[PDB]
């Protein structure tokens, strides 16, 4: 581990300039896609946020990041962050982002070891892990699916955000 | 029982047109990425032209570009290649293999169907490279196929195993990783630009053409093969 980035990193772009959307919560599930969010873009690199609110126990979240070859030519320099997700996020030490086992962040924290049958990771396309019933202090975690460094003709790619923004529920 | 089948070759002359067909079944077509993927005589495979399920999304090779035209048809399950322009380099067996992701990338190819043949006569990239051309072998020895990247690729690498008569089949990702099935003889090594295939001992049915496919960047990109023959 001991990996460190940052949001903005390379785009060069504000917390004011992102493009900031809540996830497509269904029902126990919360999922934040960036299937169609991150394809390259004339205006690019565009900077997409995905805030997961969880006020609530037992929340399933949910990940989609498209592969590299998904389709072609589009997702080609693509990278996903921490790449041992969703065991391993990020978190804001300082202002710098670091990587920390999400394990220790949240206690009794369940991560399927795999999804559809496939494992969880980012390498399979989506990560999956369900917040335990009892969340003692508020916690906040981001990942990271970033198409920026993506270049078709004029055209680049956008910054995936996903930010985990637990408060706390239980007694 | 996923099945692909191929039809619409035929003989042309130079400039003239044809169009070929792929027909799908014991899978989602609608959820599927199909590509055309055609093998010249003497040559490896080489990546046509593809679309995506939704056909928002359409790409061609250099070679073809302006000439060909892809299309499908979800409900029929079907897919379509407009060959217009015809040239004697067209020449070869053109395959419509499925798309699948395995490790890190979806650059690689699951079921391919047997191919219908394509006669044109009237009478920037990666390259891959491969060695040796061709080895024969008894059974029990060891081989060892090597196979160079003209660019960094990491370990985006695969290797297909082509029996005569039929279409390749993917044994490695991921340079070193074997899919379901393939034996523990089969061995992947390597990273950036220089990777191997080695075979600890030869059984009969190892006997085929063996091709090295990067997985990193578009286009899609093959080696020409090296021809494996037990003695």
């Known amino acids: 581990l001991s990996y460190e980035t940052t949001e903005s990193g390379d785009t060069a772009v504000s917390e004011d300039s992102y493009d900031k959307y809540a996830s497509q919560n269904t029902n126990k599930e919360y999922v934040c896609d960036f299937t169609d969010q991150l394809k390259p873009t004339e205006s690019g690199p565009k900077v997409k946020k995905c805030e997961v609110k969880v006020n609530e126990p037992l929340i399933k979240v949910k990940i989609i990041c498209p592969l590299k070859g998904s389709v072609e030519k589009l997702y080609d320099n693509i990278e996903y962050v921490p790449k041992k997700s969703p065991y391993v996020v990020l978190t804001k030490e300082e202002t710098k982002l670091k990587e920390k086992l999400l394990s220790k962040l949240i206690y009794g924290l369940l991560i399927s070891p795999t999804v559809n049958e496939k494992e969880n990771n980012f390498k399979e396309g989506v990560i999956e892990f369900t917040l335990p019933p009892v969340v003692h202090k508020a916690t906040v975690f981001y990942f990271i699916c970033d198409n920026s460094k993506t270049e078709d003709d004029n055209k680049k790619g956008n910054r995936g955000i996903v930010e985990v923004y637990v408060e706390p529920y239980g007694n | 029982e996923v099945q692909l089948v191929e039809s619409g070759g035929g003989l042309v002359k130079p400039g003239g047109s044809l169009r070929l067909s792929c027909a799908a079944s014991?899978?989602?077509?609608?959820?599927?990425?199909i590509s055309w993927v055609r093998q010249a005589p003497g040559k490896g495979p080489e990546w046509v032209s593809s679309i995506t399920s939704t056909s928002t999304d359409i790409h061609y090779a250099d070679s073809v570009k302006g000439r060909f035209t892809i299309s499908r048809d979800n409900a029929k399950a079907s897919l379509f290649l407009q060959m217009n322009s015809l040239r004697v380099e067209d020449t070869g067996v053109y395959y419509c293999?499925?798309?699948?992701?395995?490790?890190?990338?979806?650059?690689?190819?699951?079921?391919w169907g047997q191919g219908t043949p394509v006669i044109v006569s009237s009478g920037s990239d990666i390259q891959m490279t491969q060695s040796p051309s061709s080895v024969s072998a008894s059974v029990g020895d060891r081989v060892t196929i090597t196979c160079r990247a003209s660019q960094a690729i990491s370990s985006w690498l695969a290797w297909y195993q082509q029996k005569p008569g039929k279409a390749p089949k993917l044994l490695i990702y991921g340079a070193s990783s074997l899919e379901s099935g393939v034996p523990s003889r089969f061995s992947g090594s390597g990273s950036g630009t220089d990777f191997t295939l080695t075979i600890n001992s030869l059984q009969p049915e190892d006997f085929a053409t063996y091709y090295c496919?990067?997985?990193?960047?578009?286009?899609?990109?093959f080696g020409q093969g090296t021809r494996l023959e037990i003695k």
């Open positions: 293999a499925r798309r699948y992701c395995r490790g890190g990338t979806c650059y690689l190819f699951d079921h």
């Open positions: 496919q990067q997985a990193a960047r578009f286009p899609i990109t």
């Open positions: 014991g899978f989602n077509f609608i959820s599927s990425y």
